[PDB]
Structures are given as C-alpha cells and as structure tokens.
C-alpha cells in the first residue's frame, strides 16, 4: 500500500483571491486531468489490499486447546489479551517502521484514510495462519479440511523428493530446529533495523515528495513576490495580472510534476502488489516448486505477517 | 440524522451495530448500504460468516464428493 | 457430463444478466475516449490569450502584435499535448504488463496444465478455454472443487510384527472398526496391503502408532495352494 | 540494465555564468528532483545486475 493523497487546484495555486479564480478558469479542464489522476491512484491502493491480504472470504480461528506437534507457533499467533490484535513478531514490524501529516494538511494536501484499517489486516493474517496450521493447503482449493499436523509435514516432504519416513525419527530434531529459527527473527529485527528499509523508502519517497511540493509556494518563479496579497495591494489590477500569471504558470508545472511522479511510482507499487499476490497464493496457501520464488532451498510453507504499508513473508525451507 | 465517524461528518445515514457484507466504499473501516421504509445505513465492515474448524490429532477429513465448476477471467490486451 | 454442461450454461446467463463482469474491458475504451475528448476541449480555451480563434487574431491585431497572442496559444497547447502523450505512455505500461500476464495465462492454463495456486483460478486446475473479446481476451477455466466432507479417524502408522508401516500413497482412515486406505482427494476404501505400504523403522519411534494386522496378497495364494495340497494327503495314503 | 547517465542541472542551462543560476534558483527544487531521479536510475540498474 502507498499513502493516498488528494490535491485541489483552486486553493493550492492561488488562495484567497477572487481575481485569480477567473484567470484559472481560462485553463479549462487542466484541474480535471490532475484530480482524476490522483483519484484513480487512491482507488488503486485499496484494490491492492483485497488481492493480497485476504485471499478468501472465510475467516478461520485457533481452537482453545493447542497441540502443535512440538513446534511453537505462539510467536506468529495473535494475543487476545491485548486491546489490538497483533502477533509477537508483528511487535517489531509495526514499531521499527515509521506532526508531519497535520502540518501538510494546511496547504491543501489531503491524506485520505485507507479503506482497510490496521486492525482488519491482522484479522486476515490470523485467518491464514490458523488455517494453514489446521487445514494446510485444503482450504485454498475448496472447503476447509482438517488434517493432523504430522500428516501435513509428510506431504510437504513428498513434493520436494523426500520420503515421509524421514519426518518420524526427526520429529524431535525438527522441533528444536523450527523453534530456534523463529527465535532468530526476534533478534534479527531488533538488532538490525535495515531489513525493513524496503518499507521505509515508501514512506520516505512519499514524505519527501509532499515536502517538495510545498516548498514551491515560497519561490517567486521569476515574479516580484510569492505573496498574493502583496501584489494586489501594491501594483495596479492591469499590472498585477502579469505578476500573477508568472506565479500560476510556475505552480502549474510543479503540480504537474508531482502528479506525473506519482503515476510512475504507483506503477512500481502495482507491480510489487501483483508479485505479493502471487507469493501469498503459492508460498502460503499451497506449495510451489519454483526455485528462488518462495526463497532459497526446497520450500515447505510460508507464514504471512502484517506490516505497515506492506506485508512480511516468513518462509520455511529445507536446507 | 447528524452523525460523526473517523472519516468525518456523515449525514443521511444511520449507524447499525450489526455487521454484514457491504459494497460502497467509505474508508476507516466503514461502509454505506441501502436497506430497511428504507434508507441508507452505515456500519463497520464485516469479515463474513464465522466458521470454527475442529482440530484434533486423530481427526482427518477427506472429500466424499466433488463438483466441476467453470469460472471466467477477463484481462485487457 | 451433467456438471460440465451445466457450468457452461451458467455463463450465458451470467453475461446476459450481469454486464459488469466485462467492465474491465470497458474501462480501456472509457479511459481512451475521455482522454481524446479532454484533449480536444483544450482547443476552445483561450489559455490567457484574447481568443482561441486563429483567424480572429490575425485579422485584428498587427503582425508584430499578433505574435504575442499566438505564442500564448501555442505554449498552452504544447503542454496539453505533452500531457496526453505522457499519459498514454504510462497507461501503455499497464496494458503491456497485462499483456505479458495474459501471455503466461494462455500458455500454462490453456496449452498445458499448471499446478500453480490462484493462477488458473481457484481449485485444482484442469483446462482453460480462451475466448475472443474486444480489446482483450476471455479465459474460461475448468477447475476441480470438492463438495461433501466427512470426519475420519486416522493413525500415523500401523504396527503389526514390530516394524512400522507407512502409506506409499494416501493416508490411513477408519470407520470406527477396521482401518482403511484412501487418497486425500477422494474417498476410496482399500484394504491394507504390502504393495501400498513399505517397512521402515520400528514401532517404538513413531508416536501415536496403533496395532493392527497387515494383509499380505501373497498369503492367500500360498494358503489356497496349501489347501490345494491338503486333498493330496488323503489321496496317496489311501 | 541500461547506460548510467547523470545530467547536471546548472550546466544544462549555461556553464561558467551566474545569470543562469540566478533565474534557476527562483524555480525552486526542480534541480533536486531531476538529480535524484537520474541518480535513482543508476542505482536500480546496478541492482538489476
């Protein structure tokens, strides 16, 4: 997901000016081109959430009794005691990924709230995590079919070319290997904060672009002054039309550059959204034989995790 | 009907504590729908029907029947 | 035969009653029609000049004076035409990305059989039927969707002579009395045999193993042969 | 990947002259956005390799 932004041409170009409203009208539909461009981006961001986070319309939950077969899944499971539903691994994902918003809303930059809130994202993830442990790959191709967890590990070894007999003697060995690999995730996100920098650039490119668009209001753009009331209260009405025209045409290209930059950046986010939708389906729901798709090594299962303006995939591989 | 929500002032709608499948987008976890002497109602988005799947060590399920379904897909070229 | 023919008949009723399923191809025409219509409306705007008519300026002001008003009309129309070309290049990138996706769906779903999930559509994929559409293509996918389910009692392994037995294909199920062998995708009760299992490990390793007998297909053949030899004892001794 | 290119904002107008820089600073951060755009391209082309 990318930050949604809507811009109005009337006030941002020239505010609190009655004479400028007639000069801006001479440009016709120029506002309509920019308004519909940012509107289509705001709708496209909400579309990327429905095709990635929630694959199915059915919600699955964890039974009160828990037998995991020796593994510890409590790290990826949500905590019902907390007021907000989140997992233990999602604690670092939300905290390490970061007022500026209200300061930019004064100049005409409106940040639209997303259709999908943060509380409902973890509810989609908890449905896929509770289902994968119980039903495995069955609920993706049809109705949910409960299967013992010992039998689910047997088929995932069969697809990679390993006879299911290897699992039985290794039940105690794999139990220590799986639980130790999950514990390394908590130490990796706490000590190393650069692993989440992929989602930090999305916020940085959006914050720098908004701050860049604001700083153009202070520039004179070759005119006498950037203040509208300073020109109207000094020069003559026929003379002020020359200075105001220099301020308008300078702010038309600056606003057009931002909208063009958002259309190019939204194409990269849309390309990554379709990729995350394919990773979610093949790696999590089912089992993919593709190399370097679900990660290095022979793939077994994947655990999705909620992240701000993105998603985190925890892959389990056979090395 | 003067109401307020996370999105802002919303007039012409009625808040409903029930949660149903909704279409018209609003944002901030809100929808708007025309239902029952009928008007527009607004309520928090619903996740669908809740189904608790049983889990046990010896419990397993296998399909005893199957249905062949044909879907459609449309993409621009 | 009744399921496949009935699913095709629902397509005719779905496209006739619901016209919004094809709206994906309608937006391609709408975005192209609105972009051309908006590009034309720029010619009527003065762009800060006296009038948008070229013959009105040339027949009124002076040749040195008309160059100022015409320059305002040109520079205004240069950015409007540049905006459309930039918009088409961005929109063509989305269509090109969808063209490569349609090329991948055509190869794996139609020509061959893909095991990918949520690629050829929900469920276990079988075949796909391409269909011609204006400014696009329609894919009719055939999938395998299970229907009825039933709860069974399973076991990880069977212990008979002291050596564990593991399923070669499928899993072990039970109706409450005798243990049966069946596949996960279909219910096909089968007696436990030697050809459907293999001997590995022992009974003291696998947890949850249960005790039962393993029917050997070689046993009754030698048993019936032993009973065939039974009639020969009273023969020679007679 | 493609050829890595970097274009200077000041020298593109005129070099060794302060008249181009005086009117260029009045246009704001245009130099910054055009430099970061070409810089980001050269970085992504190395990531593709």
């Amino acid at each position: 997901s990318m930050t949604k932004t809507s811009v109005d041409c009337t006030m941002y170009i020239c505010g609190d000016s009655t004479e400028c409203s007639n000069l801006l009208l001479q440009y016709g539909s120029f506002c309509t081109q920019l308004n519909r461009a940012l509107t289509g981006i705001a709708v496209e961001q909400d579309k990327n959430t429905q095709e990635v986070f929630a694959q199915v319309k059915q919600i699955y939950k964890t039974p009160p009794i828990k037998d995991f077969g020796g593994f510890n899944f409590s790290q990826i499971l949500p905590d019902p005691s907390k007021p907000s539903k989140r997992s233990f691994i999602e604690d670092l994902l939300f905290n390490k990924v970061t007022d500026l918003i209200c300061a930019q809303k004064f100049n005409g930059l409106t940040v639209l709230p997303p259709l999908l809130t943060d509380e409902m994202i973890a509810q989609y993830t908890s449905a896929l995590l509770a289902g994968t442990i119980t039903s495995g790959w069955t609920f993706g191709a049809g109705a949910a079919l409960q299967i013992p967890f010992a039998m689910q590990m047997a088929y995932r070894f069969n697809g990679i070319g390993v006879t299911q007999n290897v699992l039985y003697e290794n039940q105690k060995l794999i139990a220590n290997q799986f639980n130790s690999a999950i514990g390394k995730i908590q130490d990796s996100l706490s000590s190393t904060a650069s692993a989440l920098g992929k989602l930090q650039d999305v916020v940085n490119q959006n914050a720098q672009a908004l701050n860049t668009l604001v700083k153009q209001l202070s520039s004179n753009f070759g005119a006498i002054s950037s203040v509208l009331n300073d020109i109207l209260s000094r020069l003559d009405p026929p003379e002020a039309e020359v200075q105001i025209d220099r301020l308008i045409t300078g702010r038309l290209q600056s606003l057009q550059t931002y909208v063009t930059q958002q259309l190019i950046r939204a194409a990269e986010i849309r390309a990554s959204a379709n990729l995350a939708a394919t990773k979610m389906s093949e790696c999590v729901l089912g089992q993919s034989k593709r190399v370097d798709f679900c990660g290095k090594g022979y793939h077994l299962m994947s655990f999705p995790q909620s992240a701000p303006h993105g998603v985190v995939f925890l892959h389990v591989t056979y090395v | 009907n003067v109401f307020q929500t996370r999105a802002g002032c919303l007039i012409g709608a009625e808040h409903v504590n029930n949660s149903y499948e909704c279409d018209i987008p609003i944002g901030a976890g809100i929808c708007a729908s025309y239902q029952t002497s009928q008007s527009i109602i607004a309520y928090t988005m619903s996740l669908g029907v809740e189904n608790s799947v049983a889990y046990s060590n010896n419990s397993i399920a296998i399909p005893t029947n199957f249905t062949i379904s044909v879907t459609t897909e449309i993409l621009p070229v | 035969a009744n399921q496949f023919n009935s699913a095709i008949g629902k397509i005719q009723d779905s496209l006739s009653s619901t016209a919004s399923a094809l709206g994906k191809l309608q937006d391609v025409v709408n975005q192209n029609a609105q972009a051309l219509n908006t590009l034309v409306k720029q010619l009527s705007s003065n762009f800060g000049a006296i009038s948008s008519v070229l013959n009105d300026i040339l027949s009124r002001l002076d040749p040195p004076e008309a160059e100022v008003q015409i320059d305002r009309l040109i520079t205004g129309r240069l950015q409007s035409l540049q905006t459309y070309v930039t918009q088409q290049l961005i929109r063509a990138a989305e269509i090109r990305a969808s063209a490569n996706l349609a090329a991948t769906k055509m190869s794996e779903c139609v020509l061959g059989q893909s095991k990918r999930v949520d690629f050829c559509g929900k469920g276990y994929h079988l075949m796909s039927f391409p269909q011609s559409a204006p400014h696009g293509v329609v894919f009719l996918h055939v999938t395998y969707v299970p229907a009825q389910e039933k709860n069974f009692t399973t076991a990880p392994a069977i212990c008979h002579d002291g050596k564990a037995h593991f399923p070669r294909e499928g899993v072990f199920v039970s109706n409450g009395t005798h243990w049966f062998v069946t596949q996960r995708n279909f219910y096909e009760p089968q007696i436990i045999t030697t050809d459907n299992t293999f001997v590995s490990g022992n009974c003291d390793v696998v947890i949850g193993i249960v005790n039962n007998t393993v029917y050997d297909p070689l046993q009754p053949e030698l048993d019936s042969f032993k009973e065939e030899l039974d009639k020969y004892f009273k023969n020679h001794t007679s």
Side-chain angles (χ1 to χ4, degrees), chain A, chain B, chain C:
Chain A
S1 296
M2 179 178 71
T3 299
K4 293 164 61 181
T5 300
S6 64
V7 177
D8 186 5
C9 63
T10 299
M11 179 177 71
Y12 175 77
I13 294 170
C14 52
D16 187 67
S17 179
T18 59
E19 295 84 358
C20 183
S21 63
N22 291 337
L23 296 175
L24 178 63
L25 188 146
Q26 294 177 336
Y27 296 139
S29 63
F30 179 80
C31 293
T32 300
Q33 294 178 336
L34 297 176
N35 290 337
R36 293 182 181 175
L38 296 175
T39 300
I41 295 171
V43 177
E44 183 178 2
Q45 295 300 321
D46 290 344
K47 183 178 179 180
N48 291 337
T49 59
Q50 294 178 336
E51 294 178 351
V52 175
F53 296 97
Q55 294 300 321
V56 296
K57 301 302 287 185
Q58 185 63 59
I59 303 301
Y60 297 138
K61 293 177 179 178
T62 300
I65 188 65
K66 294 183 175 74
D67 186 4
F68 296 158
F71 295 162
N72 189 340
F73 294 97
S74 296
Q75 295 300 321
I76 62 172
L77 294 175
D79 186 4
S81 64
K82 294 177 179 177
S84 63
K85 301 293 183 291
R86 67 173 64 196
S87 296
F88 295 160
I89 296 171
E90 294 177 351
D91 292 344
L92 297 174
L93 297 175
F94 295 159
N95 290 337
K96 301 299 183 181
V97 175
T98 59
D99 182 67
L100 178 63
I101 295 171
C102 57
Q104 294 176 336
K105 291 166 62 181
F106 296 159
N107 290 336
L109 296 175
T110 299
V111 176
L112 296 175
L115 177 62
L116 179 63
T117 59
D118 290 344
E119 296 301 321
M120 293 178 70
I121 294 171
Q123 293 176 334
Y124 294 141
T125 299
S126 296
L128 296 175
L129 294 174
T132 300
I133 296 170
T134 299
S135 296
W137 60 95
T138 59
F139 64 89
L145 297 173
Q146 68 283 0
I147 293 171
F149 181 81
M151 297 297 103
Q152 295 178 337
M153 295 298 294
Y155 176 77
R156 295 184 182 277
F157 294 160
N158 191 340
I160 62 172
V162 176
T163 300
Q164 63 180 19
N165 63 346
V166 177
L167 174 65
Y168 296 93
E169 293 84 358
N170 290 282
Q171 292 177 336
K172 294 177 179 177
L173 177 62
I174 297 171
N176 291 337
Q177 294 177 336
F178 178 80
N179 291 337
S180 296
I182 303 301
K184 294 177 179 177
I185 296 170
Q186 296 295 100
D187 291 344
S188 178
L189 296 175
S190 295
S191 178
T192 299
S194 64
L196 296 175
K198 294 177 179 178
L199 296 175
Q200 185 63 59
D201 290 344
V202 176
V203 177
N204 290 337
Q205 292 177 336
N206 290 336
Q208 293 177 336
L210 293 174
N211 290 337
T212 298
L213 181 64
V214 173
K215 293 177 179 178
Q216 296 296 101
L217 296 175
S218 296
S219 296
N220 291 336
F221 293 158
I224 295 170
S225 178
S226 64
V227 176
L228 296 174
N229 297 131
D230 181 67
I231 295 170
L232 296 175
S233 63
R234 181 177 181 171
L235 296 175
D236 291 344
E239 183 67 15
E241 294 178 350
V242 176
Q243 295 300 321
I244 294 171
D245 181 67
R246 294 182 182 175
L247 295 174
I248 295 171
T249 59
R251 294 182 182 175
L252 295 175
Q253 186 174 355
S254 64
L255 178 62
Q256 183 64 259
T257 300
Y258 174 77
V259 176
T260 300
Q261 185 64 59
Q262 294 295 100
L263 294 174
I264 295 170
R265 182 171 294 105
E268 183 178 2
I269 303 301
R270 178 60 178 165
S272 178
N274 291 337
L275 177 63
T278 302
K279 298 291 181 65
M280 181 67 75
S281 296
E282 296 179 353
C283 298
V284 176
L285 297 175
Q287 185 174 355
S288 178
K289 295 180 181 297
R290 296 174 64 185
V291 176
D292 189 67
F293 180 81
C294 298
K296 301 301 287 185
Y298 296 140
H299 179 61
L300 296 175
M301 68 190 84
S302 294
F303 294 158
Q305 294 300 321
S306 177
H309 300 290
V311 64
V312 175
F313 294 157
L314 296 175
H315 301 290
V316 176
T317 59
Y318 177 80
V319 176
Chain B
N1 290 336
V2 176
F3 292 157
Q4 294 178 336
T5 187
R6 295 176 63 185
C9 182
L10 178 63
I11 60 172
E14 183 178 2
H15 296 166
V16 176
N17 290 337
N18 291 336
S19 296
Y20 296 138
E21 184 278 336
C22 52
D23 187 5
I24 294 172
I26 300 299
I30 304 300
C31 284
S33 178
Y34 176 78
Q35 294 300 321
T36 59
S37 178
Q38 294 178 336
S39 63
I40 294 171
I41 60 172
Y43 59 90
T44 301
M45 294 177 70
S46 178
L47 297 175
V49 62
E50 182 178 2
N51 190 30
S52 296
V53 176
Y55 176 78
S56 295
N57 291 336
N58 61 345
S59 178
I60 188 169
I62 292 98
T64 59
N65 190 340
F66 59 90
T67 59
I68 303 301
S69 63
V70 175
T71 59
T72 187
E73 183 178 2
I74 295 98
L75 296 175
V77 175
Chain C
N2 291 337
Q3 294 177 336
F4 178 81
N5 291 336
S6 296
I8 303 301
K10 294 177 179 177
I11 296 170
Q12 296 295 100
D13 291 344
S14 178
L15 296 175
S16 295
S17 178
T18 299
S20 64
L22 296 175
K24 294 177 179 178
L25 296 175
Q26 185 63 59
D27 290 344
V28 176
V29 177
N30 290 337
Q31 292 177 336
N32 290 337
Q34 293 178 336
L36 294 174
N37 290 337
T38 300
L39 180 64
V40 174
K41 293 177 179 177
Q42 296 296 101
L43 296 175
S44 296
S45 296
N46 290 336
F47 293 159
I50 295 170
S51 178
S52 63
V53 176
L54 296 174
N55 296 131
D56 181 67
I57 295 171
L58 295 175
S59 64
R60 181 177 181 171
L61 296 175
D62 291 344
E65 183 67 14
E67 294 178 350
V68 176
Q69 295 300 321
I70 294 171
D71 181 67
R72 294 182 182 175
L73 295 175
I74 295 170
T75 58
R77 293 182 182 175
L78 295 175
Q79 186 174 355
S80 64
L81 178 62
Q82 183 64 259
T83 300
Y84 174 77
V85 176
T86 300
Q87 185 64 59
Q88 294 296 101
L89 294 174
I90 296 170
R91 182 171 294 105
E94 183 178 2
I95 303 301
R96 178 60 178 165
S98 178
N100 291 337
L101 177 63
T104 301
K105 298 291 181 65
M106 181 67 74
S107 296
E108 296 179 353
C109 298
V110 176
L111 298 175
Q113 185 174 355
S114 178
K115 295 180 182 297
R116 297 175 63 184
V117 176
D118 189 67
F119 180 81
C120 298
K122 301 301 287 185
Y124 296 140
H125 179 61
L126 296 175
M127 67 190 84
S128 294
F129 294 158
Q131 294 300 321
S132 178
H135 300 290
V137 64
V138 175
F139 294 157
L140 296 175
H141 301 290
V142 176
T143 59
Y144 177 79
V145 176
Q148 294 177 336
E149 62 184 342
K150 185 177 179 180
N151 291 337
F152 294 156
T153 299
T154 188
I158 300 301
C159 184
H160 183 197
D161 59 353
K163 292 181 295 297
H165 300 290
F166 295 157
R168 295 177 63 185
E169 294 178 351
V171 294
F172 296 159
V173 297
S174 178
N175 60 345
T177 179
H178 189 279
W179 291 92
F180 295 158
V181 176
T182 188
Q183 293 178 335
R184 294 182 182 175
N185 290 336
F186 178 80
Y187 176 75
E188 183 179 2
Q190 294 300 321
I191 305 301
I192 296 170
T193 58
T194 60
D195 59 10
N196 290 337
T197 58
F198 59 90
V199 176
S200 178
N202 61 345
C203 299
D204 291 344
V205 55
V206 177
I207 184 169
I209 186 168
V210 297
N211 291 337
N212 191 340
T213 186
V214 175
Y215 176 78
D216 186 5
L218 188 145
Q219 185 64 59
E221 183 67 15
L222 275 66
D223 187 5
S224 63
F225 177 80
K226 183 173 179 290
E227 296 301 321
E228 183 178 2
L229 179 63
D230 189 6
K231 294 176 179 177
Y232 296 140
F233 294 97
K234 300 292 183 291
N235 191 340
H236 185 198
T237 58
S238 63

